[PDB]
């Protein structure tokens, strides 16, 4: 439940645009991407299978010209053996944006080694206190240390429970180039968190010019569009691509990518949005739970409509 | 329906806390308690069984270091025989906080005798007009007389229908050290009352520094947390503990107590709340019926979110 | 669900009976009882709390005239202090029926020793090889029945009992059977309902003694269990609660209240005795009906009789 | 629920009949009636309000040609003033069928006296040993039938009636049976539906007179009751309401409206007479079907006939 | 609901057939048709709009090879101008099958005259004594069949038809029967479903011609109707709509689309001919199953064949 | 839905067995297998990703002792590079059972060549004439069985299989059948459930080998399929997922986990062998029950045995 169904674009009768004029390029921090959609690979079970799955993703990605994030490289950090499974990603995709990945427990050292491992353009640090607690002092400290010692932009990612404007503000201040929103005691967290939608609207209100990313739960192109309209500069997808891979291999995956990138252009065309920056100012109406949450949190919702 | 499901904590991505730093001690008036959870014993059927059930509760309590409230001592007041069933509680738990119990019909005399009976640290006076009417002049008068003649703090308890800021204000003014929120004509009261949640938020708005207690309906540790976040200094539980007792005796009960006290620490850890006073300022969002009720009643709801 | 909701008594317009002429006495195996209902004590958590709960259950029971079954005695078999928590049952109820209790793992020696501890009038052996996941179980039950003189009631817990299993227990020497009907997911719809078991077992052993315990919500459930073939019914949770909410005086009231409510239902049915209620015309529907039909158990006999 | 919704008439494409050729006259026991429907007065709360309601029901009834059954007369049997509230029924309706009314506790003397009070053409005796919670009931009914010359209709209230009970009442001498199908919780799903009773009783006594009252919502319900075996149907609440909302003229209209609507359904069915509607092909489904099946009552005969 | 959803074909793993070998030709009574489906024109509102709709339906029909049934001709029988709205049907479709149409009130003279108006190959007589609320109906149908040389198809509208009614129409001389299955409330659950009728009528008259019209949503519904016994199926609303949304070219497409979709279902079933599809193994469930069972119609023959 | 939810095992109170005495070995046709469960590889999208997935499935399989079926080989039959993606299966699993795979269109030469490619112990031929919309199919299957020496398992996909189709495949020489049960709308409720097929086919061919694949959610589903008659069960999606989420070590664990969970269910049932689990008393209800009943398949034998 990303809360994106609480967002409805305001219809444009005269979009005055041709699909061919639609520009979907975007900027993740200072990095330039020709796609507002990137692939979030899964760690997997390791071995030679993970290697082939990653190689395929990298090829597909390289061809579609869209970014690619690898799974956690922590294990490959201690086991020189498993390291090949990630280096193959940079070998297959030499000119594409690729993001490294490590948990918030990582040290500035490991972060550098992970980035160097695949020649990353950015480094993703994922947080997950609620999950690590069931199965946390120093997290922010560690992130702050990593940010000032890596040669690339850092993207702090929250897996599942969303992020507040306070959390985002701390990461930003600490040095994070961006944030990636993914929003017998497990019951305690059944209705816990902030929705992807609410998160974006919240963080956007306090930091208008700050890079936001949304990933997880984005079922289709309309989802991507809503997230980007709420402020996201880029969106990420995993499962969707993973399965298309195991069904039709590289050939299939590539198709699915192109298909959704074209389906986004279609939505932008119907909205009169010529570029991603235009899609970020598209009039829309927030309703339901999201609208309630934002209202109580002090976030203005009508500004999304009257703009 | 405590209305606590209308409360959702605002997620904290970087709680920056270790379970070991969590301090769950609290203050019920001037009384200090190492636990924000106390046991509300049930009167029972009397006899020697009630005696053993109370003795066990007292032992369990004494060991877990959490307060214990006995059932109404009114009957034991007129029958010198049944008195032993309560005195055993102080014998077994000599160093723990124990609250005496009497109905609002009690006199300053009986109140003193009840308190003296078990050497109570506080005295609970329960109100229940709607129940006593189906199966009330002077109630406040009697409470006011009891408060100025007992040597301990008085806790006025409402069983089931909640309490308004007006009701709380009168009891406070009368001398009550705290209030315990428990929110063929019976149909008249099917949808009658104020929810535990709404009550706390209401009373808290008019009396910020006044001791509030919440009991009844608190199914788990998250409930306790929400109540304490709404302003409660302490929460009470009965059924939950009563049954664990009859299932595994003292040994079992003790476990269940420790289990829920540790599960609360876990929630506080995920929230970044180092202490109970911190849990009382935890950003949260009120929705649904509770939010409506409070809005109409003039209580500010966004203050719980933006704080 | 016990399946008893699938049982509807055929209404009687002219019962021709007065509540005073109703006899609720029954017969568990060779044992006689003035009540078709009995308390099913719960082991609890040892300590003096059990001692007192047991003592109270024993007193009430004694005064009510209904038999009492104690919780498992495996612990008292080893601990002296705990043993007193059971001996008290007989000390307070010297003339009433009392059933001793042990698991199907118990040895004949243990069975005998448990019986002597409380001067039991019958012994309950509970099964549930399902939770214990073995071999010998049946043979161990057989010895127990041979070793003890008093009737042995083998109690199944929650999953029901088929005519085949009942028959095996009977051949082993059991005086009666007590019907209570990541891997745990496999047994979500596993079993035979209380109703289906009573009807099934009764079809193969019309004279054998059956008991129904667990789930029985009220007098009417008791009435149906007996109508379906049970000679006695057991109840725990209801009584336990009545004890912790009103003490002995409470329990004694609830025990009487339910016995009088049973006599009422029998009056409305024209059943003067427990043997009559066992021949009361009724109609079986829904799942129960299908199960019994596929299993070859006649269902119209309950209606045409 | 009467269970009549479980009855669906087999459609007739070529009825070959005109509304004018339809005969709705029937026969209650030895009594003849030009209507298969009759008013079922309600005792009310005595006083002059009953006197007037009765008088109105009597007038309407008289003008409509349909029989009228008065509420219980037990009070008039003792009070002179109240007695006039019933005598008026015959005073205003001197040539119509009228049924007297008493409880199953009534004595033969009372029965006879109630009949003479209004010059009754039949006597209703209502049962409900269920609410009275006895012995003798049946024997008391027997005497009543023997003591009174007019036919006695034993009316069951709400819980239905089995073939066994009906048979007992018939042996007792009843001319017909009127089917109306903290402890109160025991009887929430207790009983036999109106439909199930008619079908059951009819299976054992094909010539005996049965009546269906209570629940009948409209003409179609009347049609089904008769089709299932009833010789007459009773209605109260509907008429009572029609009286307090439009007076006599209203009641008289509603009475005619429903009688003409019955003739219509019969026309669409090709049933020229009441004896034909009683052999009308129909299909029994749902609960009714199961009940009858388990009770050994044939259901296909209603369809293949 | 037609009840066809209660019919599920038994799947065939190895049909052993090519869409090219499938033959959908059938036989309505003595009439031959290259299509098991036909258009059921709608009288409409006279005027030149009917003339044009009819003309279009006739053209499409003609080109598609499927028979066309015109709406009621009772008005043209009296009005010259309107008459042209039907004569045009034959003028535009000189070699195709066309059915004339009249109500069951029509007289043999009218029937004959309606047939001559369009040079009909068969005549439809629609029933619905239900809405007309008489006597003679059947006898009038008989004369009509005798007076006209072409086959007469008696069409029931919405309430279904029982084996008894069908049998009467057959004895009267009907070549086939067309199954279409404040007082209005009485007929809310009145009738026999299309499926139940076909199965019932077929059980008594295995060789007689039956038609199913109304409700058929698509090719699969057509497949089931035939499987259940129908020799032809009728469709209106679907075609009418196709005409007002795409004109003749549209209708002609929809007509072909559905015929090819039928051949597909037959291919998947291994039914090469219409006579094969009529012996296709299927399973009857739900209401239909019960109805047929209670009515004594065998249901397993549809499955074991 | 597989229909397996309509199957409930009859509970056994005294199984008399230890998990150690349970034997899950079975027999597919003439082939012997130490496991009643096998992996059902998925063709995927060629390339080195298939080569690796296959290699991993082969390794796991090999270590687990369970047979492996490869995806379609039609592509490898023509492409050399792809061929290696299958040859590797045997290279990594030299002593385990492996099934080759081809469509029902394949020619005997292709069948033989596919078998030699991986040194197959059996060959699977999948059907689905439904999606291919022909003639010869059966005759082509026959030749394939004759041309290849190893047993041929004809696999139906999603729509089930009737006793008739199974019988045809058996006469053709198939060693076993693998049950997997704008126009697309026609087949929304088309087919026979996995359960219904196994029961149906078993009724006509008590000794013939059947396999159940697809839908099986867990060990209990496996238990039921076998109980209903299957000699082996297939699983894909579950294993595939386990591979992409934990690699070989994961798959090997899930394979063992499910095999031990099967042995548990058998222990609770008292079934020591696979041949015993095939005679385990069970009750069939709902749709399955009706289908089998109408199709003339006995359902009580599953319960009374
Ligand atoms: C097997 C598995 C492995 C994953 N590994 C990683 C990881 O290494 N790093 C990370 O940041 N997220 C990881 N994720 C989370 C996903 O990237 C993402 O947050 C979401 O759960 C799945 O994306 P989707 O909703 O687009 O399918 C994993 C998810 C699964 C199911
Ligand atoms: C049998 C019984 C006896 C009780 N006796 C008392 C009492 O003496 N004094 C009191 O203040 N509340 C009494 N209560 C109320 C509980 O303390 C509390 O308000 C609530 O109903 C039960 O707590 P829970 O929701 O945590 O189980 C009693 C409740 C029950 C069921
Ligand atoms: C706390 C507790 C302890 C129990 N102990 C035993 C026991 O020692 N032996 C036994 O045969 N049944 C035992 N039972 C089962 C009950 O006697 C009975 O069969 C049923 O599961 C629960 O009560 P009911 O009959 O009111 O539903 C226990 C039940 C509970 C709740
Ligand atoms: C106010 C009132 C009084 C009634 N009094 C009698 C009575 O004296 N005797 C009797 O046999 N039935 C009596 N009935 C029952 C009705 O005649 C009838 O059987 C049924 O319960 C209610 O009307 P219905 O047939 O329209 O459903 C009474 C019903 C009502 C509502
Ligand atoms: C506007 C309209 C006029 C119709 N006129 C006739 C008619 O004259 N004669 C007749 O036998 N059926 C007539 N029908 C019935 C249809 O031919 C058919 O049996 C069915 O009720 C409606 O179409 P369907 O088969 O597509 O459901 C008419 C239906 C409609 C909607
Ligand atoms: C990606 C994919 C490829 C498959 N390829 C084949 C194949 O080549 N041959 C075959 O007989 N079945 C094939 N299947 C069917 C499966 O083996 C199996 O019968 C079922 O449809 C899906 O797995 P399940 O058994 O876990 O439900 C395939 C299924 C999937 C998802």
Swiss-Prot record, chains A, B:
Annotated Gene Ontology cellular components are: cytoplasm
Record carries keyword Magnesium: yes
Residues that hold FMN according to the record: 41-43, 72, 101, 157, 216-217, 238-239
Which residues of the sequence carry a binding annotation for Mg(2+)? Answer: 132
Give, as one word, the top-level EC class: isomerase
State the compartments where it is located. Answer: Cytoplasm
GO molecular function terms listed in the Swiss-Prot or TrEMBL record = FMN binding; isopentenyl-diphosphate delta-isomerase activity; magnesium ion binding; NADPH binding; oxidoreductase activity
Q: Which cofactor does it need?
A: FMN; NADPH; Mg(2+)
Q: Which GO terms describe its biological process?
A: isoprenoid biosynthetic process
Keywords for this entry?
Cytoplasm, Flavoprotein, FMN, Isomerase, Isoprene biosynthesis, Magnesium, Metal-binding, NADP
What is catalysed by this protein?
isopentenyl diphosphate = dimethylallyl diphosphate
Binding-site positions, substrate? 131
Q: Return the EC number.
A: 5.3.3.2
Q: Quaternary structure?
A: Homooctamer. Dimer of tetramers.
Q: Which HAMAP family match?
A: Idi_2
Check the record and name the PANTHER family matching this protein: ISOPENTENYL-DIPHOSPHATE DELTA-ISOMERASE
Q: What family does the entry list?
A: Belongs to the IPP isomerase type 2 family.
What NCBIfam families does the entry give? Answer: IPP_isom_2
Q: What does this protein do?
A: Involved in the biosynthesis of isoprenoids. Catalyzes the 1,3-allylic rearrangement of the homoallylic substrate isopentenyl (IPP) to its allylic isomer, dimethylallyl diphosphate (DMAPP).
Task: State the name under which the record lists this protein.
Answer: Isopentenyl-diphosphate delta-isomerase
UniProtKB/Swiss-Prot annotation, chains C, D, E, F:
The record's section on Pfam families has: FMN_dh (PF01070)
Q: What cofactor requirement does the entry state?
A: FMN; NADPH; Mg(2+)
Gene3D superfamilies for this protein: Aldolase class I
Q: Say where the protein is mainly found.
A: cytoplasm
Its GO biological process annotations read: isoprenoid biosynthetic process
**InterPro entries from the UniProt entry:** Aldolase_TIM, FMN-dep_DH, IPdP_isomerase
Q: What class of enzyme is it?
A: isomerase
UniProt: substrate binding residues: 131
Where in or outside the cell is it found?
Cytoplasm
Q: Which reaction does it catalyse?
A: isopentenyl diphosphate = dimethylallyl diphosphate
Q: An example Gene Ontology cellular component term from the record?
A: cytoplasm
> Which Gene Ontology molecular-function terms are recorded?
FMN binding; isopentenyl-diphosphate delta-isomerase activity; magnesium ion binding; NADPH binding; oxidoreductase activity
Write out the residues that bind FMN: 41-43, 72, 101, 155, 214-215, 236-237
Binding residues for Mg(2+), per the UniProt record? 132
The family database entries (CDD domains) matched by this protein are listed as: IDI-2_FMN (cd02811)
- Domain of life where this protein originates: Bacteria
The record's comment on protein family reads:
Belongs to the IPP isomerase type 2 family.
Quaternary structure note: Homooctamer. Dimer of tetramers.
Q: How is this protein named in the record?
A: Isopentenyl-diphosphate delta-isomerase
């Amino acid at each position: 439940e990303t809360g994106l169904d609480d967002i409805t674009f305001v219809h444009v009768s005269l979009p005055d645009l041709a699909l061919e004029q639609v520009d979907i390029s975007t900027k993740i921090g200072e990095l330039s991407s020709s796609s507002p959609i990137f692939i979030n690979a899964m760690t997997g079970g390791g071995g030679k299978l993970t290697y082939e799955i990653n190689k395929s993703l990298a090829r597909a990605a390289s061809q579609a010209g869209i970014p690619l994030a690898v799974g956690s490289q922590m294990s490959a950090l201690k086991d020189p053996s498993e390291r090949l499974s990630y280096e193959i990603v940079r070998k297959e995709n030499p000119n594409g944006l690729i993001f490294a990945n490590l948990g918030s427990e990582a040290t500035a050292a490991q972060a550098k080694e992970a980035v160097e491992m695949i020649g990353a353009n950015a480094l993703q640090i994922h947080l997950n206190v609620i999950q690590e607690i069931v199965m946390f002092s120093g997290a922010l400290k560690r992130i702050e240390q990593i940010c000032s010692r890596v040669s690339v932009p850092v993207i702090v990612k929250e897996v599942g429970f969303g992020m507040s404007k306070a959390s985002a503000g701390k990461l930003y201040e600490a040095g994070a180039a961006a944030v990636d929103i993914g929003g017998r005691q497990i019951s305690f967290f059944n209705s816990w968190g902030i929705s992807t939608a609410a998160s974006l609207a919240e963080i956007r209100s306090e930091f208008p010019a700050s890079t936001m990313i949304a990933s997880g739960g984005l079922q289709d192109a309309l989802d991507v569009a809503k997230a980007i309209a709420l402020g996201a500069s880029c969106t990420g997808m995993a499962g969707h691509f993973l399965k298309a891979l195991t069904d039709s291999g590289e050939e299939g995956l590539l198709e699915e990518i192109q298909l959704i990138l074209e389906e986004l252009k279609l939505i932008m065309t119907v909205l009169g949005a010529r570029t991603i920056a235009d899609l970020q100012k598209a009039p829309l109406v927030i309703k339901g739970e999201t609208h309630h949450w934002l209202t109580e949190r002090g976030v203005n919702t009508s500004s999304y409509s009257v703009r």
